[PDB]
Amino acid sequence: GSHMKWFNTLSHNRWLEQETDRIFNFGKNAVVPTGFGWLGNKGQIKEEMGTHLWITARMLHVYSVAASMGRPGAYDLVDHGIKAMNGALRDKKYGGWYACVNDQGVVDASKQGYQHFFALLGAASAVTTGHPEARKLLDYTIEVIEKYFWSEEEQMCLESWDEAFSQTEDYRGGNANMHAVEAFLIVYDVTHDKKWLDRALRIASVIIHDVARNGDYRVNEHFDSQWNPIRDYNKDNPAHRFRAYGGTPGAWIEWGRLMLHLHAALEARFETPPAWLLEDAKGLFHATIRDAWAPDGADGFVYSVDWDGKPIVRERVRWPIVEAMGTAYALYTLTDDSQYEEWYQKWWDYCIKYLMDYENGSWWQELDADNKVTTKVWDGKQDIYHLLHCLVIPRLPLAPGLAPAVAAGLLDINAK
Amino acid sequence: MKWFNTLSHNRWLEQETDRIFNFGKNAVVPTGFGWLGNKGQIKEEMGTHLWITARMLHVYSVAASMGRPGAYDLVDHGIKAMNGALRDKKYGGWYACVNDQGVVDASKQGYQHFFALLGAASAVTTGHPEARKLLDYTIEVIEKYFWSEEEQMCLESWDEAFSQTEDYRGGNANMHAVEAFLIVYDVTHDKKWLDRALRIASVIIHDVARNGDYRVNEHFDSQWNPIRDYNKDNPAHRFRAYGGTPGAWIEWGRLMLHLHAALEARFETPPAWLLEDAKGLFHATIRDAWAPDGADGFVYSVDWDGKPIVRERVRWPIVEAMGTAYALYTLTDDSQYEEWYQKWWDYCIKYLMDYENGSWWQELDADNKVTTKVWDGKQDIYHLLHCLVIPRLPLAPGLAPAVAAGLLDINAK
Amino acid sequence: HHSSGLVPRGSHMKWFNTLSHNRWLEQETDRIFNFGKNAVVPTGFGWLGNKGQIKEEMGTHLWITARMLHVYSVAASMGRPGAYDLVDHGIKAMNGALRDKKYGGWYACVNDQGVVDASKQGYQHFFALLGAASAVTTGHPEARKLLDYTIEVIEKYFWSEEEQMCLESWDEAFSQTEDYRGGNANMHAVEAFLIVYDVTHDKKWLDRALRIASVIIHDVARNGDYRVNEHFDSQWNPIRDYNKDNPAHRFRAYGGTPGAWIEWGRLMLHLHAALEARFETPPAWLLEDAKGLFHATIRDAWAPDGADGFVYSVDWDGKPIVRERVRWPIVEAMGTAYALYTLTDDSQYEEWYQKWWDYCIKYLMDYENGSWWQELDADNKVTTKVWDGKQDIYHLLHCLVIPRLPLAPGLAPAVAAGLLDINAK
Amino acid sequence: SHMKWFNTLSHNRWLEQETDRIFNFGKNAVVPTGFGWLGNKGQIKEEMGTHLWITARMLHVYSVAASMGRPGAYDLVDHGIKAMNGALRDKKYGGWYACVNDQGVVDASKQGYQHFFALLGAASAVTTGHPEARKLLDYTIEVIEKYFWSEEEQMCLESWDEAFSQTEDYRGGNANMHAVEAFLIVYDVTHDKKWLDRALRIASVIIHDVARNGDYRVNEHFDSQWNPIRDYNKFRAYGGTPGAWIEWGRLMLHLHAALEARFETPPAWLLEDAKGLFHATIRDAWAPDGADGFVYSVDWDGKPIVRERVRWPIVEAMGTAYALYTLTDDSQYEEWYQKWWDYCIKYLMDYENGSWWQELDADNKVTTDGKQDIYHLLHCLVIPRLPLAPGLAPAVAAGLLDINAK
Ligand SMILES: O=S(=O)(O)C[C@H]1O[C@](O)(CO)[C@@H](O)[C@@H]1O
Ligand SMILES: O=S(=O)(O)C[C@H]1O[C@](O)(CO)[C@@H](O)[C@@H]1O
Ligand SMILES: O=S(=O)(O)C[C@H]1O[C@](O)(CO)[C@@H](O)[C@@H]1O
Ligand SMILES: O=S(=O)(O)C[C@H]1O[C@](O)(CO)[C@@H](O)[C@@H]1O
C-alpha cells in the first residue's frame, strides 16, 4: 500500500530503549554469589538450576552493553561477572570453566565448547567497558579456546571435553560453531587480529556455503569427527534444548545475521565482501520463512523441522522469532528491500501479543502450537541476551558489532 | 576564541581546500603528475617523480570522497601511472623519476615507496576497481624490500635491481612509513600495520628523541646508531637536512596521536608515551624553531643545541604544526593548542597563502619574504590537507578513510 | 537492467545526500544564476552567447523568457538577493510585449520594434505554464493571476479533451492547428502539469500527466525497445521519417533524441513520487519504464563511437545520426540517475551520476567565459553545429538542485517548502 | 505564500559569502597608526589620515571575523588594540584624538560619537580574549564615565576640546544612539546592569518622550537643557534622519532581548516604539519621490530634504526588519527585508571595484568620498544569523551563528 517506517526512526528506537530498560531490570535479580542464576517465570532465582557458565557469560555480555548505555549498576554486574569467571566457575586444576557450579561446589564439571564460546563473547564485550580485568580475562579465554576448542587440524571448533581435557566428544556441532563465529566477530572488533575474522569466514564457508546451501538452506547441526552430517542425531530426543533432531530454523536465520556482520566488517575496512555472505543470508532468511513460519495454521516459528522441512517440534520458543527480527534489520540495512521491514513489523506485533509479559516480567520462553503459554522444551525465563538482537541491534550499524558499536557512541547514529 | 569544531571555521577551511584542489589539477602529464611551478604550470625539466605522483593519488582520493567532480578521474590517472611508466616491469617497485622519453632516476627510494603505499591505501577508500590490486602489490614490494623483519624498522633505498641497500637508515622514510601504515591498517584492520607503526615510533622517538630533549635524530648508520654530523657539508638538503628538522618533530607528534586514537577505537589502552612524547615534540618544536631569530615562523633546521642552521621558512613545518595543535587539542582539551593553531593560521594567510598566483608559497627567507634557496616551485599540495581537512575529522580512522566514511564536520556545530 | 560503460567498483564512493557534495552543487548553482542575469532586456530575457553577452539578433523568445522566470523563482526561494526582481521582470514580460492582446497566449518571439514570430507554439506555452506555476511558489502577488490566465490558454488551445493529449501549435489567430503531434511539447506539458498539481492539488493535472506518459512511453516507446517516438500525425500514428531531410533540428531531430528518453524517465519518477506522497501505490510501469528509458539511453547514445558522451540522435536501429554532444542530454541523464537511485537504492545509478559529473567538469563547464558550453563535437571539443551560444541555464537545475531535494513535491515547490538538503548529512 | 529567507541555511550561506567579500575589502585599510580611509577601488586615501571612528569600527569588525574563524582577523584585532594604545591615544589629557597620521595629530578634538565607537570596539575585542582587550575596555570605561556619560543629566555629552576644558553647547541623538549600541556590548562582557539601565534611560528620553510625541520623527538636535532645536543647521543634517529612526528601533529590540534573556519583563514601549519608528521610516522616507530607496533627511512634515540614498539607512532598515520579525513573527517584516536586499544588489553592491557604493542620487545612480565603512554591513549580513541577545560580537563568540536556521 505504502511504506510504514520504523527502522531508523527515533519514535520506534525510543520504544525499543524503554523495553530494553524493562529487560535490563529483570536480569538484575539473577545475581548470586557464584555468578548469575537461572530466572523463573516471576523473575525469581530457580536456585535448584545453580550457576551455569553460559548464563553467567551471557549476563557479562548483556551488562557490558547496559554499562555503555549509561545505566547505573550495570558496571557492577560486569565486575560481578568477571569475578565469577576468575572464581567458582574457573577450574583451578585443569583450566577453562565448569559448565555449572553452586555454593556447595561443582554441579557439572564438563568443558562445553558451546558455553566456552559464550565465555569468549562475554570477555570481548566486557573489554568495551574498559573494566581493568576485562582484557586479562579475554587473553586467558583466548588461550583456552586455542588450546582446546579451535582445531588447527580441522580449521573448525570442537564440541566438548571431560573436566580434565583428556578426551574430546565424538561429535561436531553447528550450534557451538555458530556461537564461535558470534564471539570471533567481537574478539576481532577488540583486537584487529585478522585470524578471528578468517576463522569466522571459514566456519561459515563449511556449515552454510557448503552443507546448508546444498540442502535448500536447511542448516545441518550434527556432525561426526570427520565433519560428515549425522542426519538421524537425537531422533529419540527431538525437543533437546541445544541439539534438536533435524533442523532448528531459528539457528538458520541467526547464521544469516552473523554472516551480514562478517560482510559489514569487510565493508568497514573498504574491502569488497564475497557475494556468498549476502546471497546465503538471503537464502537462510527465505528458507526459515518457507519451512518454519506459520506452517501449521497459526502464526509463529516452529522449533524444529525434518530434512523435508516439515515441522517436528511445533512449540514457539522465544529466541527464533527474536533472531528473525535481528536478521530482518540486517537484510534491510544491506538491501533497502522493504519486505524485510514488513517482516520485522509483523514479528514485533506477534511478540507483544503472545511473548511479552508485562504482568510477571520479561517475555515468555515458550508457547504451544496455538501460541498459548506452555512448559515442554524449557523451564523459566533464564535468558535476556537474545533480546538485545531485536531491541539494540536495530539501533546500530552492522559494524563494528553490538558491544563495540554501543561503546563507540553509535546508538541511533542513523535515526531521525 | 573558538575555531575548532565550529562550522564557520570549517566552511573557511573547505573553501581554501577547493582552491588547493584546483591548483593541483594542472599537474596531470601522460606518465603521472608533474612538478608545478609558482604559477601552477608544469616545470617539464623536473619530469614525473614517484613521490609527487603517489601524493597526488592520495590528494584526489580525499577530493573524490568530498564529492568534487573530476577528482575520481585524477585517481584513475594516478592508478594508471602506478601501473605504467613509473612501474619497473623487470625488477618490480617503482623508478624514482621518469619522463615521456623513459627512466630519469632508476633508484628504488624507500621514502617514495612509502608514499606509493599511502597513495594506494587512500585510493582504496574511493572503491576505484584497480585500487585494492595496487595496494596488494605495493604491500608485497614494501614487505620484500623496505620493511626489515630482522631490524623491525624500514630500510632507506636500493639500486634499480634491488641488489644493494644504502648504508643509511632515515627518520624521514620511517616517519612516512608510520603515516602509510596507519591508512593500510584502516583499509585492512590487520593489527600488524599498527604494531609496525608503534615499533618505529618506539625506536626513533621514545628511545632517541626523548633522551635528547625531543630533538629528533633523523640520520643513522646500518646498525641504527646516530650519525650526528650527517650532511654537515650540505645542510639545506630537501629530504636529509643537517641536524634536526623541527617540522618533522611536530609531524611525528601528530602521527603518534593517530596511533593512540586507533588503539582507543578498538578498546585498547594506548601506551602513555604516545601522548607524553607528542607533547614533548610539540613543545621542543616551539622552544627551538618558533621565531628563534627575531621574526615569526618555523626555521627549517637546528643544531643539537637547538640553534637555527637553515633559517628559511619552508611551508610544510608550520602546516604540520597546525595539524599537531589540532590533534593535541582533540586529546587534551587544552586551549593552549588552539591558540597556537590560530596564531599559525594568521601567519599563513599573511606570508604563505598566494591568492594572486595560486596555492601557497613553498619557501620564505628569515624575514618571511618569498625566496628560492632550499626549493623551486609549488610541487606539493598533500601537506595542506593536514591543516585544511584533518581539523574537520576525528583522529581515527585516518584522513582518507574518515572522509570516505562521511565523518567531515562530525564533531562541529 | 544493467548497461555497458561502468567498470565494477570495490566500495561505494558516497556523494548523494552528503553535505560536502551538495555544497559543491550550491556553489556551482550560484555561478549559473550569475551568468543568466545578463539576459535581462526590456521585453523579457535575451539569448546569451558564449561570453554571456546578449545576441540581440536572436530577439526575445517566449521559451527562454518562461524558463528564466522558472529559474529565478528557484533562486528567490534559495534566498538569493535580486532573484525576486528577475521573477517580477519575468511576470511583467509575460503580461507585456510577448502577450497577444487580440487573440490571447504569447507570440513565440518579439523585439523592441514588435512581433518577430507571431505563431502560438505549444512547446513554448507549456514552458509559460511551468514558469507561472514556479513563480506561484515565490508568492509574487501577480503570479497566481498569471497561472490562472495560462491555464485558460492551455485548456482552450493546447490540451485536447477529444484526444486526451496536447496539440503542437497554431497560427497567431488560433484559426488552424499544425497537422503534427509532438513528444517534446507533450513531455514539457507533463513537466509543467506536475508543478501546476503541486500549487493546486486539482487532480486533473496529475491525471493528464499520467495519460500523456501512458501513450508516448508505456504504449509507443516500450513497444520500440524504449526508443521514444516524438513525431506523430493528427491521428497519433508515428511519422518515423519526419525531418529525414533536416536531421539536426534543435527541437524535432530525425529519429530518436536519447536525451528526451532519459528526461521522460525522471518525469515519470516525479509522477511516482507524487502518488507515494499522498499514500497511493503508484502503478509499477512508471518505475519499470523509467528504468527501460535510462538503460535504452545508455545502450544507444552513451559513447557509441569511440569517445565518452551522449550523441544527440539515433535512427530506429539505434545507429547514431547527429554525433555532437549537446549539453542538456547528459544534464538530464544525471537528474534521472539521482531519481532512480532515490527509488531503487541501486548504486549503479550513483556510479553513472559520478562518471557524468567527471565528464561535465572535464569538457562542458566553462570557468573562463562562464556557464557551460552548449555543444561539443564527437571528440568532446567545443563546436557550433546544432546550436549557437549559451542561451539556457534551466536544464542545469536538474543536475545542481534536483539531487538536493526529494522527488515530491517538484523543484520550485520543494525549495520553497525548505526541503534543500533535507536528506543530507 | 511566504517566501522564506530568515532562518534558512541557504540564505545564511549567501550572507556568509558576501560577509567574506566585505572582510577582504577592509583588510587593505591597515596603516601603521590604525585603519585608513578606503576609496572606491579599495585603495587607502592617505590624505584622509587615521580617524578614531574608522579605527574603532574596524577593531569591532575584525573581532566578529576572528570569532567566525577567519585567519588574519585576530592580527587586525591586535593591530586595532595597538592603535588605540598608540598615536590615537592622548597621553597628556586622556581619551583619543579624532584624527592622526604618521607625522602627528590632525584633529585633536574629543568627539563623543567617536569615543562611543572606541567603547564598542574595546567591548567587541574582549569577546576574542585578546590579552590587552580587557585593559583597553577598562581604560575606555574610565574616559566615558569621566567625560561622556553625565551622572547629572543621565544622558551622554557630545564633544570637548583636546584638554577637556569646555564641552560643546549641544546634545545629539547620534552620539547618544551609538552610546546605547556600545553599552549593550559592555553589558554583554561585564553583566553589570548599570550599562543596560543607562541604555534604557537614553532611549526613554530621545524615543519614548520626544520621538513618540512627534509621530516617531526623531529629534536629533538639542541644547544643553535637552530642549529640541528644531531649526538646527538650517552627522548633523537639518530635520529628521530616517536611517537613525529605524536604527534606534533595532537597538531598543536588543535592549528588550537582553531583559528577556535574564527572565525580566521588558517594558512594553521598547517593542511599541520600535514598530512606530519602523513604520514612520517607511511612511516618510521609503520611495517618497517617485523612485525606490531611503532618502537621507526629511522636514518635520516628513517631506524629503536631502534625497541622496546613502548606504547605511537601508542597511539599518534591513537589520530592524530582522529584529521585528524575530519578536513579532509578522511576515510583513521579512517582505521588507527581501525587497531591501533586492534593491541593495541592484544599486549598492559593487562586484567590479569591491564592497558597496556609499552614496547614490535620487535615481539610485552612483554619485560624488569613498568606501571608508564596512561596520554597518554586519547589521544586514551577520545580525540576521544571530539571536537578539547577547549582541553581535558576543553571540558570534558564543557559537550562536545560524543557531535558529535549518
Ligand atoms: O537463550 S535460551 O533460549 O535460554 C538458549 C538457546 O540459545 C541457542 O543457542 C540459540 O542460538 C539455542 O540452541 C539455545 O537453546
Ligand atoms: O612537500 S614538500 O615540501 O614538497 C617535501 C617534504 O616532505 C617532507 O618529508 C616532510 O614530511 C620533507 O622532508 C620533504 O622535503
Ligand atoms: O535548453 S536548450 O538546449 O537551449 C533547449 C532544448 O530543450 C529540449 O526540449 C530538451 O528537453 C530540446 O528539445 C531543446 O533543444
Ligand atoms: O558608516 S558611514 O556611512 O561611513 C558613517 C555614518 O554612521 C552614522 O552614525 C549612522 O548611524 C552616520 O551619522 C554617519 O554618517
Side-chain angles (χ1 to χ4, degrees), chain C residues 21 25 330-332 334-335 353 357 372 395-403:
Chain C
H21 179 61
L25 293 178
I330 190 167
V331 166
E332 290 308 325
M334 291 153 83
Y353 175 85
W357 260 121
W372 297 29
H395 283 284
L396 290 174
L397 303 191
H398 301 160
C399 69
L400 289 177
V401 185
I402 277 194

PDB file of all heavy atoms in Angstrom, chain C residues 21 25 330-332 334-335 353 357 372 395-403:
ATOM      1  N   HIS C  21      29.194  17.170  -1.028  1.00  0.00           N
ATOM      2  CA  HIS C  21      28.819  17.219  -2.471  1.00  0.00           C
ATOM      3  C   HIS C  21      27.799  18.342  -2.693  1.00  0.00           C
ATOM      4  O   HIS C  21      27.943  19.111  -3.664  1.00  0.00           O
ATOM      5  CB  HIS C  21      28.281  15.881  -2.976  1.00  0.00           C
ATOM      6  CG  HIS C  21      27.872  15.918  -4.411  1.00  0.00           C
ATOM      7  ND1 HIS C  21      28.762  16.203  -5.421  1.00  0.00           N
ATOM      8  CD2 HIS C  21      26.671  15.721  -5.008  1.00  0.00           C
ATOM      9  CE1 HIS C  21      28.114  16.164  -6.586  1.00  0.00           C
ATOM     10  NE2 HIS C  21      26.834  15.862  -6.364  1.00  0.00           N
ATOM     11  N   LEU C  25      27.647  21.584  -5.249  1.00  0.00           N
ATOM     12  CA  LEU C  25      26.492  21.825  -6.162  1.00  0.00           C
ATOM     13  C   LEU C  25      25.967  23.249  -5.958  1.00  0.00           C
ATOM     14  O   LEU C  25      25.708  23.926  -6.955  1.00  0.00           O
ATOM     15  CB  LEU C  25      25.366  20.814  -5.908  1.00  0.00           C
ATOM     16  CG  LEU C  25      25.643  19.361  -6.244  1.00  0.00           C
ATOM     17  CD1 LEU C  25      24.448  18.509  -5.876  1.00  0.00           C
ATOM     18  CD2 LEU C  25      25.968  19.180  -7.714  1.00  0.00           C
ATOM     19  N   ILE C 330      23.143  15.004 -21.216  1.00  0.00           N
ATOM     20  CA  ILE C 330      23.920  14.430 -20.081  1.00  0.00           C
ATOM     21  C   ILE C 330      23.421  15.060 -18.772  1.00  0.00           C
ATOM     22  O   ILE C 330      23.398  14.355 -17.745  1.00  0.00           O
ATOM     23  CB  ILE C 330      25.436  14.594 -20.267  1.00  0.00           C
ATOM     24  CG1 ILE C 330      26.197  13.793 -19.211  1.00  0.00           C
ATOM     25  CG2 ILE C 330      25.851  16.052 -20.268  1.00  0.00           C
ATOM     26  CD1 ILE C 330      27.663  13.639 -19.496  1.00  0.00           C
ATOM     27  N   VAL C 331      22.988  16.322 -18.802  1.00  0.00           N
ATOM     28  CA  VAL C 331      22.435  17.005 -17.598  1.00  0.00           C
ATOM     29  C   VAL C 331      21.177  16.270 -17.149  1.00  0.00           C
ATOM     30  O   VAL C 331      21.072  15.970 -15.952  1.00  0.00           O
ATOM     31  CB  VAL C 331      22.186  18.485 -17.870  1.00  0.00           C
ATOM     32  CG1 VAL C 331      21.330  19.136 -16.797  1.00  0.00           C
ATOM     33  CG2 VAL C 331      23.513  19.197 -18.015  1.00  0.00           C
ATOM     34  N   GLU C 332      20.278  15.960 -18.089  1.00  0.00           N
ATOM     35  CA  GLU C 332      19.037  15.205 -17.816  1.00  0.00           C
ATOM     36  C   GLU C 332      19.397  13.799 -17.323  1.00  0.00           C
ATOM     37  O   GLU C 332      18.740  13.315 -16.360  1.00  0.00           O
ATOM     38  CB  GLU C 332      18.137  15.213 -19.059  1.00  0.00           C
ATOM     39  CG  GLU C 332      17.548  16.580 -19.351  1.00  0.00           C
ATOM     40  CD  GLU C 332      16.842  17.218 -18.169  1.00  0.00           C
ATOM     41  OE1 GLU C 332      16.225  16.471 -17.377  1.00  0.00           O
ATOM     42  OE2 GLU C 332      16.906  18.447 -18.033  1.00  0.00           O
ATOM     43  N   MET C 334      21.911  12.858 -15.619  1.00  0.00           N
ATOM     44  CA  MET C 334      22.378  12.987 -14.215  1.00  0.00           C
ATOM     45  C   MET C 334      21.173  13.135 -13.289  1.00  0.00           C
ATOM     46  O   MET C 334      21.162  12.460 -12.246  1.00  0.00           O
ATOM     47  CB  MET C 334      23.344  14.170 -14.078  1.00  0.00           C
ATOM     48  CG  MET C 334      24.658  13.902 -14.784  1.00  0.00           C
ATOM     49  SD  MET C 334      25.504  15.407 -15.346  1.00  0.00           S
ATOM     50  CE  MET C 334      26.299  15.821 -13.794  1.00  0.00           C
ATOM     51  N   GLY C 335      20.156  13.922 -13.692  1.00  0.00           N
ATOM     52  CA  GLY C 335      18.904  14.056 -12.942  1.00  0.00           C
ATOM     53  C   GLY C 335      18.218  12.719 -12.769  1.00  0.00           C
ATOM     54  O   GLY C 335      17.745  12.404 -11.644  1.00  0.00           O
ATOM     55  N   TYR C 353      25.974   8.786 -12.262  1.00  0.00           N
ATOM     56  CA  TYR C 353      25.947  10.213 -11.856  1.00  0.00           C
ATOM     57  C   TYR C 353      27.379  10.732 -11.696  1.00  0.00           C
ATOM     58  O   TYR C 353      27.703  11.802 -12.223  1.00  0.00           O
ATOM     59  CB  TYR C 353      25.134  10.369 -10.573  1.00  0.00           C
ATOM     60  CG  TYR C 353      25.097  11.748  -9.966  1.00  0.00           C
ATOM     61  CD1 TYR C 353      24.182  12.697 -10.398  1.00  0.00           C
ATOM     62  CD2 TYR C 353      25.911  12.063  -8.885  1.00  0.00           C
ATOM     63  CE1 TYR C 353      24.119  13.945  -9.795  1.00  0.00           C
ATOM     64  CE2 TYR C 353      25.859  13.300  -8.276  1.00  0.00           C
ATOM     65  CZ  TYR C 353      24.951  14.244  -8.720  1.00  0.00           C
ATOM     66  OH  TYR C 353      24.909  15.460  -8.096  1.00  0.00           O
ATOM     67  N   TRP C 357      29.286  13.505 -13.912  1.00  0.00           N
ATOM     68  CA  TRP C 357      29.865  14.727 -13.303  1.00  0.00           C
ATOM     69  C   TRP C 357      31.322  14.909 -13.739  1.00  0.00           C
ATOM     70  O   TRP C 357      31.703  16.067 -14.034  1.00  0.00           O
ATOM     71  CB  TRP C 357      29.726  14.752 -11.783  1.00  0.00           C
ATOM     72  CG  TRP C 357      28.584  15.608 -11.341  1.00  0.00           C
ATOM     73  CD1 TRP C 357      27.505  15.231 -10.598  1.00  0.00           C
ATOM     74  CD2 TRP C 357      28.393  16.991 -11.664  1.00  0.00           C
ATOM     75  NE1 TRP C 357      26.661  16.294 -10.429  1.00  0.00           N
ATOM     76  CE2 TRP C 357      27.170  17.382 -11.093  1.00  0.00           C
ATOM     77  CE3 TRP C 357      29.121  17.928 -12.400  1.00  0.00           C
ATOM     78  CZ2 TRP C 357      26.677  18.678 -11.207  1.00  0.00           C
ATOM     79  CZ3 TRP C 357      28.616  19.201 -12.537  1.00  0.00           C
ATOM     80  CH2 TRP C 357      27.413  19.564 -11.951  1.00  0.00           C
ATOM     81  N   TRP C 372      28.343  26.836 -18.962  1.00  0.00           N
ATOM     82  CA  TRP C 372      28.804  25.591 -19.617  1.00  0.00           C
ATOM     83  C   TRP C 372      28.706  25.802 -21.130  1.00  0.00           C
ATOM     84  O   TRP C 372      27.809  26.541 -21.577  1.00  0.00           O
ATOM     85  CB  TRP C 372      27.938  24.389 -19.209  1.00  0.00           C
ATOM     86  CG  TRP C 372      27.923  23.973 -17.765  1.00  0.00           C
ATOM     87  CD1 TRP C 372      28.117  24.732 -16.645  1.00  0.00           C
ATOM     88  CD2 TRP C 372      27.589  22.656 -17.294  1.00  0.00           C
ATOM     89  NE1 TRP C 372      27.970  23.968 -15.520  1.00  0.00           N
ATOM     90  CE2 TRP C 372      27.627  22.694 -15.883  1.00  0.00           C
ATOM     91  CE3 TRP C 372      27.260  21.456 -17.925  1.00  0.00           C
ATOM     92  CZ2 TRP C 372      27.349  21.575 -15.107  1.00  0.00           C
ATOM     93  CZ3 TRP C 372      26.980  20.344 -17.158  1.00  0.00           C
ATOM     94  CH2 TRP C 372      27.053  20.403 -15.770  1.00  0.00           C
ATOM     95  N   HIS C 395      18.049  23.791 -17.684  1.00  0.00           N
ATOM     96  CA  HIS C 395      18.394  22.345 -17.584  1.00  0.00           C
ATOM     97  C   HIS C 395      19.343  22.123 -16.407  1.00  0.00           C
ATOM     98  O   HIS C 395      19.206  21.073 -15.755  1.00  0.00           O
ATOM     99  CB  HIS C 395      19.006  21.768 -18.871  1.00  0.00           C
ATOM    100  CG  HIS C 395      18.008  21.488 -19.946  1.00  0.00           C
ATOM    101  ND1 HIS C 395      17.168  20.401 -19.923  1.00  0.00           N
ATOM    102  CD2 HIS C 395      17.730  22.142 -21.096  1.00  0.00           C
ATOM    103  CE1 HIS C 395      16.411  20.403 -21.012  1.00  0.00           C
ATOM    104  NE2 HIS C 395      16.735  21.459 -21.738  1.00  0.00           N
ATOM    105  N   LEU C 396      20.247  23.062 -16.120  1.00  0.00           N
ATOM    106  CA  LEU C 396      21.332  22.820 -15.133  1.00  0.00           C
ATOM    107  C   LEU C 396      20.780  22.592 -13.717  1.00  0.00           C
ATOM    108  O   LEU C 396      21.466  21.915 -12.937  1.00  0.00           O
ATOM    109  CB  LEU C 396      22.317  23.984 -15.170  1.00  0.00           C
ATOM    110  CG  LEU C 396      23.148  24.041 -16.451  1.00  0.00           C
ATOM    111  CD1 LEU C 396      24.001  25.297 -16.519  1.00  0.00           C
ATOM    112  CD2 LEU C 396      24.033  22.813 -16.552  1.00  0.00           C
ATOM    113  N   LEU C 397      19.588  23.111 -13.405  1.00  0.00           N
ATOM    114  CA  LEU C 397      18.980  22.916 -12.071  1.00  0.00           C
ATOM    115  C   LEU C 397      18.658  21.426 -11.875  1.00  0.00           C
ATOM    116  O   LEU C 397      18.548  20.997 -10.725  1.00  0.00           O
ATOM    117  CB  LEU C 397      17.726  23.785 -11.931  1.00  0.00           C
ATOM    118  CG  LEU C 397      17.912  25.287 -12.151  1.00  0.00           C
ATOM    119  CD1 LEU C 397      16.662  26.030 -11.707  1.00  0.00           C
ATOM    120  CD2 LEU C 397      19.143  25.818 -11.427  1.00  0.00           C
ATOM    121  N   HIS C 398      18.527  20.660 -12.962  1.00  0.00           N
ATOM    122  CA  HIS C 398      18.182  19.220 -12.902  1.00  0.00           C
ATOM    123  C   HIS C 398      19.388  18.385 -12.453  1.00  0.00           C
ATOM    124  O   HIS C 398      19.149  17.282 -11.923  1.00  0.00           O
ATOM    125  CB  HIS C 398      17.590  18.759 -14.226  1.00  0.00           C
ATOM    126  CG  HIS C 398      16.363  19.523 -14.595  1.00  0.00           C
ATOM    127  ND1 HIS C 398      15.887  19.574 -15.885  1.00  0.00           N
ATOM    128  CD2 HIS C 398      15.506  20.255 -13.838  1.00  0.00           C
ATOM    129  CE1 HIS C 398      14.793  20.322 -15.907  1.00  0.00           C
ATOM    130  NE2 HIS C 398      14.522  20.741 -14.658  1.00  0.00           N
ATOM    131  N   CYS C 399      20.618  18.868 -12.597  1.00  0.00           N
ATOM    132  CA  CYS C 399      21.824  18.163 -12.041  1.00  0.00           C
ATOM    133  C   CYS C 399      22.412  18.931 -10.848  1.00  0.00           C
ATOM    134  O   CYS C 399      23.256  18.352 -10.158  1.00  0.00           O
ATOM    135  CB  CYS C 399      22.875  17.894 -13.105  1.00  0.00           C
ATOM    136  SG  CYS C 399      23.715  19.366 -13.731  1.00  0.00           S
ATOM    137  N   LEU C 400      21.957  20.165 -10.566  1.00  0.00           N
ATOM    138  CA  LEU C 400      22.542  21.010  -9.497  1.00  0.00           C
ATOM    139  C   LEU C 400      21.640  21.110  -8.270  1.00  0.00           C
ATOM    140  O   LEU C 400      22.205  21.205  -7.162  1.00  0.00           O
ATOM    141  CB  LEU C 400      22.826  22.411 -10.041  1.00  0.00           C
ATOM    142  CG  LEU C 400      23.988  22.515 -11.023  1.00  0.00           C
ATOM    143  CD1 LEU C 400      24.107  23.936 -11.519  1.00  0.00           C
ATOM    144  CD2 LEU C 400      25.307  22.089 -10.375  1.00  0.00           C
ATOM    145  N   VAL C 401      20.316  21.159  -8.455  1.00  0.00           N
ATOM    146  CA  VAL C 401      19.343  21.386  -7.352  1.00  0.00           C
ATOM    147  C   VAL C 401      18.531  20.106  -7.111  1.00  0.00           C
ATOM    148  O   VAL C 401      18.312  19.740  -5.950  1.00  0.00           O
ATOM    149  CB  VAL C 401      18.451  22.599  -7.657  1.00  0.00           C
ATOM    150  CG1 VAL C 401      17.539  22.930  -6.486  1.00  0.00           C
ATOM    151  CG2 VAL C 401      19.310  23.812  -8.042  1.00  0.00           C
ATOM    152  N   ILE C 402      18.071  19.442  -8.165  1.00  0.00           N
ATOM    153  CA  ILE C 402      17.210  18.229  -8.027  1.00  0.00           C
ATOM    154  C   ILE C 402      17.877  17.197  -7.110  1.00  0.00           C
ATOM    155  O   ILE C 402      17.206  16.620  -6.266  1.00  0.00           O
ATOM    156  CB  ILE C 402      16.825  17.704  -9.425  1.00  0.00           C
ATOM    157  CG1 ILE C 402      15.613  18.505  -9.925  1.00  0.00           C
ATOM    158  CG2 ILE C 402      16.593  16.202  -9.422  1.00  0.00           C
ATOM    159  CD1 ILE C 402      14.898  17.907 -11.123  1.00  0.00           C
ATOM    160  N   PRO C 403      19.198  16.913  -7.206  1.00  0.00           N
ATOM    161  CA  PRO C 403      19.839  15.946  -6.308  1.00  0.00           C
ATOM    162  C   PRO C 403      19.931  16.338  -4.833  1.00  0.00           C
ATOM    163  O   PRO C 403      20.453  15.551  -4.058  1.00  0.00           O
ATOM    164  CB  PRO C 403      21.260  15.803  -6.877  1.00  0.00           C
ATOM    165  CG  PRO C 403      21.101  16.233  -8.308  1.00  0.00           C
ATOM    166  CD  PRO C 403      20.130  17.398  -8.228  1.00  0.00           C
TER     167      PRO C 403
END
